[PDB]
Amino acid sequence: IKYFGGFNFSQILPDPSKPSKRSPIEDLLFNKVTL
């Protein structure tokens, strides 16, 4: 359960839905960097 007193953390917490266990912010950073 993630009821942090009303503080929403889904943006930075890891998201298990995607195959890679990375947060939406981390995934945005990864896609924004081209190797």
Ligand X SMILES: *[C@@H]1O[C@H](CO)[C@@H](O)[C@H](O)[C@H]1NC(C)=O
Ligand Y SMILES: *[C@@H]1O[C@H](CO)[C@@H](O[C@@H]2O[C@H](CO)[C@@H](O)[C@H](O)[C@H]2NC(C)=O)[C@H](O)[C@H]1NC(C)=O
Residues that bind ligand X (CB under 6 A): 1, 3
Output the six-digit token pair for 6: 């009303």
CA–CA gap between residue 35 and residue 23 (Å, rounded): 20
11 makes contact, choosing from ligand Y, ligand X, none, with CB < 5 to 8 Å by partner type, with ligand Y
1 makes contact, choosing from ligand X, ligand Y, none, with CB < 5 to 8 Å by partner type, with ligand X
CA atoms within 13 A on the CB side of 26: 11
Residue bearing tokens 């953390």: 9
Which of 2/35 has CB closer to ligand Y?
2
Q: Name the site residues for ligand Y (rule: CB under 6 A).
A: 8, 10-11
